[PDB]
Enzyme design. Sequence first.
Site, PDB file in Angstrom:
ATOM      1  N   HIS A   1       0.850  -1.216   0.000  1.00 35.68           N
ATOM      2  CA  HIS A   1       0.000   0.000   0.000  1.00 35.68           C
ATOM      3  C   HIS A   1       0.876   1.253   0.000  1.00 35.68           C
ATOM      4  CE1 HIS A   1      -3.188  -2.862   1.217  1.00 35.68           C
ATOM      5  NE2 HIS A   1      -3.877  -2.093   0.371  1.00 35.68           N
TER       6      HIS A   1
ATOM      7  N   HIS B   1       1.668   1.576  -5.744  1.00 35.93           N
ATOM      8  CA  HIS B   1       0.249   1.126  -5.790  1.00 35.93           C
ATOM      9  C   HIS B   1      -0.638   2.303  -6.208  1.00 35.93           C
ATOM     10  CE1 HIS B   1      -3.567  -0.717  -4.850  1.00 35.93           C
ATOM     11  NE2 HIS B   1      -3.791   0.171  -3.874  1.00 35.93           N
TER      12      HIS B   1
ATOM     13  N   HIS C   1      -6.020   7.432  -3.035  1.00 36.10           N
ATOM     14  CA  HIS C   1      -7.049   6.548  -2.414  1.00 36.10           C
ATOM     15  C   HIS C   1      -6.474   5.779  -1.212  1.00 36.10           C
ATOM     16  CE1 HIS C   1      -5.229   3.146  -4.505  1.00 36.10           C
ATOM     17  NE2 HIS C   1      -5.915   2.394  -3.645  1.00 36.10           N
ATOM     18  N   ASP C   2      -5.157   5.627  -1.099  1.00 33.05           N
ATOM     19  CA  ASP C   2      -4.541   4.871   0.029  1.00 33.05           C
ATOM     20  C   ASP C   2      -3.543   5.764   0.799  1.00 33.05           C
ATOM     21  OD1 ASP C   2      -5.674   2.213   0.313  1.00 33.05           O
ATOM     22  OD2 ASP C   2      -4.522   1.488  -1.406  1.00 33.05           O
TER      23      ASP C   2
HETATM   24 MG   LIG Z   1      -7.341   1.016   0.452  1.00 32.18          MG
HETATM   25 ZN   LIG Z   2      -5.581   0.494  -2.824  1.00 29.07          ZN
END
Ligand SMILES: [Mg+2]
Ligand SMILES: [Zn+2]
Length: 313
Positions: free
Chosen positions: A68, A72, A106-107
């Site tokens: 993550h 990614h 998003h992460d």
């Molecule tokens: Mg996530």
């Molecule tokens: Zn993700």
Amino acid sequence: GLMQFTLPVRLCKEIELFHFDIGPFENMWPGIFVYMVHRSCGTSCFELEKLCRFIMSVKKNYRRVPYHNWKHAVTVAHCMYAILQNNHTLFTDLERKGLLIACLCHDLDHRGFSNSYLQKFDHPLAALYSTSTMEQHHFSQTVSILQLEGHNIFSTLSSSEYEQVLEIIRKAIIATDLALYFGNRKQLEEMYQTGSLNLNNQSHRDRVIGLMMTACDLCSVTKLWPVTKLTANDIYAEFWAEGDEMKKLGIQPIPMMDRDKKDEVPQGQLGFYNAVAIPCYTTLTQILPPTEPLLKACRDNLSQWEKVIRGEE
Ligand SMILES: [Mg+2]
Ligand SMILES: [Zn+2]
Ligand SMILES: COc1ccc(CN(Cc2nc3ccccc3c(=O)[nH]2)C(=O)Nc2ccccc2)cc1
């Protein structure tokens, strides 16, 4: 304004394909993302100075975790790029702007632990956000970065366009909570099969963007086998560390996270492909026919995991 990003010939060609791998050169990823914004959105969408400063602050707020991480973020933004480029006329100017940024962010500030581990640890974030814990944190981090001086890439949007885009990003980031995916896809499945699906209905668009976010988020299973297989090792590296940490809280982790049950990984991958990945890309292909290559690659990777079980690799 007349300053385009250009890539080497092999990347210029392959970046258009769903199964593109962004490569091991971290310093090329920002330019790859800017290239994708310029082609998906326009060279005018963002002040290049503000976008470059946004991108580098986003990079800094991703941690050095096995999966993550910053790679990614850019990988998931590239899958969104491929979807948007194969579905030219289906998305508004604000949606193309919003979704590439949503995917990159998003992460944000992921610690390499699931929403479940945060709740069992009794992490402060679990008290602040009772459901979709990390995902509400990722959206929170995105807003904080947008509000740094010189970082507001949406500054030239009207008040209502700014409100709409932040709403597209919020829903997009929340949809990456896989706990929400199952219900979202079933609803989209019913709507498609009964013919009630209507892309001018905002609640319907929201659902379709949600599935697109899941599809981009899971896109590791849609690469060439050697990328899929080597990415799986990064995903399990996080899961097994989480399993170790569950054991330290005196809780037996689920087999998925128990490094002592490595042997069960091939059969566990079959479950994932059949329960999550194949359904996801099947419904996406029904709604957005040109995303069929993602479904095809996913089925190819299921067949490779079946070959691993049968001792053929
Ligand atoms: Mg996530
Ligand atoms: Zn993700
Ligand atoms: C794309 O890369 C990846 C990497 C890891 C995963 C984790 N994963 C697969 C998995 N691996 C195992 C290993 C050992 C023992 C048992 C299992 C197991 O039951 N599942 C998963 O979500 N399972 C699942 C099954 C059914 C439904 C939902 C989820 C998923 C995707």
